[PDB]
Amino acid sequence: NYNGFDEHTEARIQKLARTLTAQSMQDPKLDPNSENFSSAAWVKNMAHLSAADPDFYKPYSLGCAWKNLSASGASADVAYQSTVVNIPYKILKSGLRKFQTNTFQILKPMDGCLNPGELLVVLGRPGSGCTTLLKSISSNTHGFDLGADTKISYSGYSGDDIKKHFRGEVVYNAEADVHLPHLTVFETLVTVARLKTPQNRIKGVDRESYANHLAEVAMATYGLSHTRNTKVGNDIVRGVSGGERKRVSIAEVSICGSKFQCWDNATRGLDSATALEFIRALKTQADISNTSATVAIYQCSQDAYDLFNKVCVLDDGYQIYYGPADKAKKYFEDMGYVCPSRQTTADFLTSVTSPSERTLNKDMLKKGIHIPQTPKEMNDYWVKSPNYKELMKEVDQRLLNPYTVSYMMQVKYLLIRNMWRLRNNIGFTLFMILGNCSMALILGSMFFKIMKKGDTSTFYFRGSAMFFAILFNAFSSLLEIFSLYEARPITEKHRTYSLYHPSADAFASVLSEIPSKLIIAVCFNIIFYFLVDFRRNGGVFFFYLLINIVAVFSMSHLFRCVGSLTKTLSEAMVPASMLLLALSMYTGFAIPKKKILRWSKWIWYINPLAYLFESLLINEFHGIKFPCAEYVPRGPAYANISSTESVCTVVGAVPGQDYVLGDDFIRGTYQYYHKDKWRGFGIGMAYVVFFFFVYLFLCEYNGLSKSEAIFHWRNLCYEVQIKAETRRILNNVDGWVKPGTLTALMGASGAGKTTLLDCLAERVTMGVITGDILVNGIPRDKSFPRSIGYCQQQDLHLKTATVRESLRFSAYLRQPAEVSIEEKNRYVEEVIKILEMEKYADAVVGVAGEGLNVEQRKRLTIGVELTAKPKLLVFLDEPTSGLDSQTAWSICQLMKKLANHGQAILCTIHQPSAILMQEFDRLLFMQRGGKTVYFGDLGEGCKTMIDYFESHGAHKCPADANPAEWMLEVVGAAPGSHANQDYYEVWRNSEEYRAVQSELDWMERELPHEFSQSIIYQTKLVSIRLFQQYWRSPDYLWSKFILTIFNQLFIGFTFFKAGTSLQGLQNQMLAVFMFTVIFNPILQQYLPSFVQQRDLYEARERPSRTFSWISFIFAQIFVEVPWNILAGTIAYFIYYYPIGFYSNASAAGQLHERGALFWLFSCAFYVYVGSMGLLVISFNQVAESAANLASLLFTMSLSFCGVMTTPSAMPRFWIFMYRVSPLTYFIQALLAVGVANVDVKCADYELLEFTPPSGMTCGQYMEPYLQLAKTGYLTDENATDTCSFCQISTTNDYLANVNSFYSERWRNYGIFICYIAFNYIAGVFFYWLARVP
Hints:
Blueprint: H1 7-23, H2 39-51, E1 64-74, H3 87-99, E2 103-114, E3 119-123, H4 130-137, E4 144-146, E5 151-154, E6 157-158, H5 159-164, H6 185-196, H7 207-221, H8 242-255, H9 272-288, E7 293-295, H10 302-305, E8 310-315, E9 318-324, H11 328-335, H12 345-351, H13 362-366, H14 375-384, H15 386-399, H16 407-424, H17 426-445, H18 459-474, H19 482-496, H20 502-512, H21 514-532, H22 538-565, H23 569-585, H24 601-605, H25 608-621, E10 625-627, E11 659-661, H26 662-669, H27 679-701, E12 712-720, E13 727-736, E14 742-747, H28 755-760, E15 768-774, E16 789-791, H29 803-814, H30 823-834, E17 846-847, E18 850-851, H31 854-866, E19 874-876, H32 885-901, E20 905-908, H33 914-917, E21 922-926, E22 930-937, H34 943-951, H35 963-970, H36 983-989, H37 991-1003, H38 1015-1030, H39 1034-1054, H40 1062-1074, H41 1079-1101, H42 1109-1136, H43 1141-1148, H44 1151-1178, H45 1183-1199, H46 1215-1220, H47 1222-1235, E23 1248-1250, H48 1258-1262, H49 1265-1268, E24 1273-1274, E25 1283-1286, H50 1291-1298, H51 1305-1330
Parallel strand pairs: 3-7, 3-8, 13-22, 14-20, 14-21, 16-19, 19-20
Antiparallel strand pairs: 1-2, 1-4, 1-5, 5-6, 8-9, 10-11, 12-13, 12-15, 17-18, 21-22, 23-25, 24-25
Helix pairs in contact: 1-2, 1-7, 6-7, 6-8, 6-16, 7-8, 8-9, 16-20, 17-21, 18-22, 18-25, 20-27, 21-22, 22-25, 22-27, 23-39, 25-27, 29-30, 29-31, 38-42, 39-41, 39-42, 40-47, 41-44, 41-45, 42-44, 43-44, 44-45, 44-47, 44-51, 47-50, 47-51
Pfam families: ABC2_membrane, ABC_tran, ABC_trans_N, PDR_CDR
Domain ABC transporter: 96-341, 711-954
Subcellular location: Cell membrane
């Protein structure tokens, strides 16, 4: 723990400075190695060194003065929920409003002044203008505006000045938690130290040594020298604890040299012991570096108050007082109020602003002197006060009169920072490397057999292999986007400091990743190029590798620009998906350049992958001769042939050749001419450089039912095994609760405050409880956990349901079944009134940022347990934890009211202020380890407990000390307590224990279907809720529908009426191939909803018995399907017709059946997508691991689909996979239903031509072949000089080669339905095994 620059820090700093001086070897008030050295002088001299550079105007120290400060904000107009149907009109009205006044006053006129070195604390209730004031005085005026009369002067330099020249000397920190988790503390501080050394004014020590020493000192001063090698961490990453983490921010901003500061919500979620240390460290900064700071805090302990110089009290956006810290209480007592005996000064100052907690001075009322009682009157009285007449003088007397290190080093140090990040989180990088190695080794094998021959039968596979290689190279980098969004908040923080250019951060992010790219592009490419058996020449292999490197760089730098514009990955999934489809579809292989329609050619002319693939193929085919495989006239009857009487079944063939010159094949099919070898590299570099610079530019510039059971427990014991076998956490605890009483349960950092609720509430999961808990003198049973409420300490609700819906849902599912839905509603009205929330019953629960504020959410969570008509206790857990004083008192009053009505309550409590304590009728206090110390009436003013403890030997209590902490100091439980005896034994022997035991003995003479609803009703209600939750989530549904209506329509139109030529049939097959790649975006969009609702269920709904898991999972299934079916129907309508399938359907006369079945497949595919996305998340904690697994399975299924490589060419092993994947059946059925039963039309360049033998027509020459094989047609039969031949007479002969059939469409449909069903069933089973206890 920390003591505020005690002798230890001085010793450590002297040691470090001695080390610095010794290492430098190549007045005595300053020298490490002399006598009477003083650390403060040394640290202050380093500070001045950092500040007073000869050629910098940076001021020595900044105060602040402000008179008539006035802030107003945009009007709070009415709002409404953004249902899926409302978001269009809402978008329209908002856009019109922005394209083409109404305001409100937030801060009424204020004055003030703050001097170098002082500390200012801005007190006030929530929503009283604290944040607005803090932002105003630091010139961060965004979201509002300052009135014209305002005037601010930072000790000489107007507000506009520091915006132009000294930003960095004025800081604002809404929160001190933003830190990059995976570095160590030293690695977090030393980089900032390096960035800030005045590089031109150090002598006799190298740059790095001075930076290391400055970081070491900056750790030592703020008591962090024991976390030198721990990760800073976050909520989910283990590291330094909360207080230490918040002190890291002060150390960082100390090195950064900010002279003025502001901290808005500084001490969130810090106990009284840690907030004090944080404030003390801030005081040390103000003491040493001569800064000045202002902190706005809630629950300011008296100890933390004594350190502050000045206090600013706010109310309803006014100013009540602003003067020295210790004179505030006297001024407020002279005002007319009286501070109760035990109330702390800060709580007193805050409470006076709340009508209910005040205590007027009766003497003044009796004599008839006006006492202000509303904030306006208080402001008037203050303005009339002499304190203001002094403050105006102290104001007027002040109001009457770029990056340290050059750009290259800003890049260098950030690059090293990124390398450290990688080294501390190396598992993420090895995942990528191993994944790409595995993908290469797998998808290479798939080609391993066919390629060996090298004949003209592998041309299509030589195309597909390049397709896979170029895609899996280009898109292997996108995993780096996560580390961009992770590091954006920290870069935004460091921008506020004049620390480094954002361009520098981006430039370092580009470079730091290069090693991973040039490891993957070597391993993957070597493996793949070896396996697929391309040309062995090294002089072409190196060019292939170069082209892949350029492709990966190009796409990496394009998607960095895409990820820069959008706020978060959730935003980027849609536009990134659309751009990915555009770039991967127009690569020049799915649709060859010859067949691209006019309206989309330009897309091919601006696609870098198109040119790179062109270069790859020109390289791979140019100037190499492939021997033939099969000539078009075949069979024994053709045993005699002249060279000119035969040709190859391939595009570029020439009659009389023993081979085909690959140059001619690429010319014939794709129109790539060998003179275009380097165009691809040239354009690739242009795109890389251009999009890199665009990336940099963008980053630079952008009534209640009574209780009836006297619940009591005796001899209760608790034991666990995890840390050690058979150790005891509750040791013979005993007590009771009587209806109509409010009992509290306090304990130290030791005793199980919580564990004694969970053992009682039957909510523990492990261990053994000994002894008996009794209800009416007989043990609890299976029915118990439905008769007790339990208000979690947290507040977690479905963010789309409104308060009345949240209440009524639980009312329905928890209350007994025999009450009609009419009565439960009047009971919900009872509950709404008794909690006094009738004004906002119809608000949206939302999240903390935009919705119900914390007090309202805690009122709600209590509401949800009353509405279940529990008959036994209503347990709570630390209801006041996290709440400021005023809302804590409000909740305490609510609990007292519920207790008065007749509802028993047993509530844990943590650090309650002295005023709250009186409200709890009883108490149960426990020591380190579950030993009970006290159990009895708390008495009036806590006298009864103080009497007991003082009677048995405890040191007396001060007349104004807080009892709730006094007793914590009486017996252990406090740092350095040293209790004078064991208070467990005194209780064991006391009279009170005898009375309690006698009562329980008399208590044992007092004695004289695990889910309320069925499964069907639970599923009905939960499904209705989940429907309301998809609805009211416009983002999900619309980013689903527009994504589909683009991807499908784009794919449909690019192949608009592809025809029925051989290339046409291949293009239609690929079109059915790109129909499916929409799997991943839709699955990833769907996943978060399930995660949200499952997290709510397993946390709150499961233990409380609200509904059974079966009903939850069936709600998921029964709701996700009706949306996917609609999406599939839309996709069918926009996809089936443009590409021309219906025209094929009419010819065969089967339009109705071939349309209905196609629609059924377009529905089944989306239902399958939903089911697969449910299965993969059934057994995963996180959405991202589920997305990873789903993408991997989809890639594996799609690669072996029999379309990228036909199953004949597949190696022997992988045949099994080609049979078990579902997409093979899907493609076989859909393509067949598309293009079956129609005649083929070979084009002008497809047709094979040659000469017939002399003295016979073409028909007679060819006819025997047209019997040895049973398909093909001749454009002419009476020709004599030459003929033209087309191997395929009907598409039903092409499909058979693709291994699809039109007679097997319904069977494939049946198998696909079977796969959907299996996915759902296995999802349910894996949920039952991986999550249900």
